[PDB]
A = this chain, B = another copy of it.
Amino acid sequence: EFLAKMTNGFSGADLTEICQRACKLAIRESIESEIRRERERQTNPSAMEVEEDDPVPEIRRDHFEEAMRFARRSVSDNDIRKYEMFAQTLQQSRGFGDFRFPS
């Protein structure tokens, strides 16, 4: 809900991108975390993690906090006024307005 009312003028195809940028930003760290775990210097059987450590099991908070920095609204204000102007080109129930039948 806090991510909802912060993105204000964003189109529906723009905030569907940041929930892929955050997934890419977490897959980068989950690939990179497995590099050091196999590249342990003197990788000895002593004190070995027989259990999977799972450093990134799910998308955390700072992935969205970092993926939000590259957000950009695609539609401007100058072109939404074009569709509002076409909506005004439809006469939009304007003219006389209310009248009543006689009694």
Contact B98 A69 (CB under 8 A): yes
Segment among A24-32, A35-43, A44-52, A72-80 that sits at the interface with chain B:
A72-80
With CB as the reference atom, state the residue of chain B lying closest to A91.
Answer: B72
Q: Give, as a whole number of angstroms, the nearest-CB distance from A84 to chain B.
A: 13
Interface check A6, CB cutoff 8 A: yes
* Chain B residue contacts of A16, Cβ below 8 A: none
**Mind listing 8 A-B residue pairs with CB under 8 Å?**
A61-B101, A65-B100, A65-B101, A68-B99, A69-B93, A69-B97, A72-B90, A72-B91
Binding site for B on A (CB under 8 A): 2, 5-6, 8, 61, 64-65, 68-73, 76-78, 90-102
